[PDB]
Design a protein around this ligand. Structure first.
Ligand SMILES: O=C(O)c1c(O)cccc1O
Ligand SMILES: O=C(O)c1c(O)cccc1O
Ligand SMILES: O=C(O)c1c(O)cccc1O
Ligand SMILES: [Zn+2]
Length: 257
């Protein structure tokens, strides 16, 4: 099955998932000079006070921190979004070196990692019906650079050694995702897709301009995870990013002048 290796990575995915060569695939490069400020964008609202985290899972591609989405609790609204979107999970993508790791790029610059907070449109009942719709999902994307440690990331880092291999999970209650946000909510937005198979074209992307800073030690611990399962040869979980895809007939809009 699919992955990030030479033999099963991004350049192969189109054979099982033809939408890989679709009209609104992600990630993309954000050309900051071509992005236009959009005065029609409403204020973004990220309301995480009631977020209820449950569990952290190594899925053999990344780790997911999963939330209880059975009530209206951690929601994203405003900006380009119509209505209310409910947080279901977050995960990251990162490199084998600090010079690469993000999926979106900014004027071709790769960050060391990228965080995705995934939300589904509450008009559609749950996530599974939301991914049948062209406005089913909203993903808040946040770049990570290497510098000072991010304190609100450390409880994630400290549980990783308990989910080293594919299929492992751990309790991960009482985690506050507010600690992963930068100060500013300035963002770029465009319509795109999931970035791993099944690559579905359901996502309103909201990519924050301000990166968060994490320490070298925090990202080095991400790189100790494994793609493999327990007992199998070690293949370190690094470089689990899809590169930029053609923009096609899309415009990237800025929330800021
Ligand atoms: O993601 C993977 O499945 C993978 C491999 O199976 C082998 C090397 C690198 C890699 O990312
Ligand atoms: O969360 C859900 O309700 C869900 C999924 O997370 C995946 C598939 C179907 C579905 O309803
Ligand atoms: O690729 C993704 O972006 C993705 C999600 O964001 C949520 C669930 C599955 C998935 O592949
Ligand atoms: Zn992702």
């Amino acid at each position: 099955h699919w992955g990030y290796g030479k033999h099963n990575g991004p350049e192969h995915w189109h054979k099982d998932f033809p939408i890989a060569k679709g009209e609104r695939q992600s990630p993309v490069d954000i050309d900051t000079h071509t992005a236009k400020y959009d005065p029609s964008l409403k204020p973004l609202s990220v309301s995480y006070d009631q977020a209820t985290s449950l569990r952290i899972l190594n899925n053999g591609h990344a780790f997911n921190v999963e939330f209880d989405d059975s009530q209206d609790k951690a929601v994203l609204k405003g900006g380009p979004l119509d209505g209310t979107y409910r947080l279901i999970q977050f995960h990251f993508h990162w490199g084998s070196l600090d010079g690469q790791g993000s999926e979106h790029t900014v004027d071709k610059k790769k960050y060391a990692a990228e965080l995705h907070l995934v939300h589904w449109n509450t008009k559609y009942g749950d996530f599974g019906k939301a991914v049948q719709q062209p406005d089913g999902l909203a993903v808040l994307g946040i770049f990570l650079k290497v510098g000072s440690a991010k304190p609100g990331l450390q409880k994630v880092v400290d549980v990783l050694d308990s989910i080293k291999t594919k299929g492992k999970s751990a309790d991960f209650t009482n985690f506050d995702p507010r600690g992963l946000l930068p100060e500013s909510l300035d963002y770029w937005t465009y319509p795109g897709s999931l970035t791993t198979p099944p690559l579905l074209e359901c996502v309103t992307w909201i990519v924050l301009k301000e990166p968060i800073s994490v320490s070298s030690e925090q990202v080095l611990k991400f790189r100790k995870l494994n793609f493999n399962g327990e007992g199998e040869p070690e293949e370190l979980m690094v470089d689990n990013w899809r590169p930029a895809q053609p923009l096609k007939n899309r415009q990237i809009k800025a929330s800021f002048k």
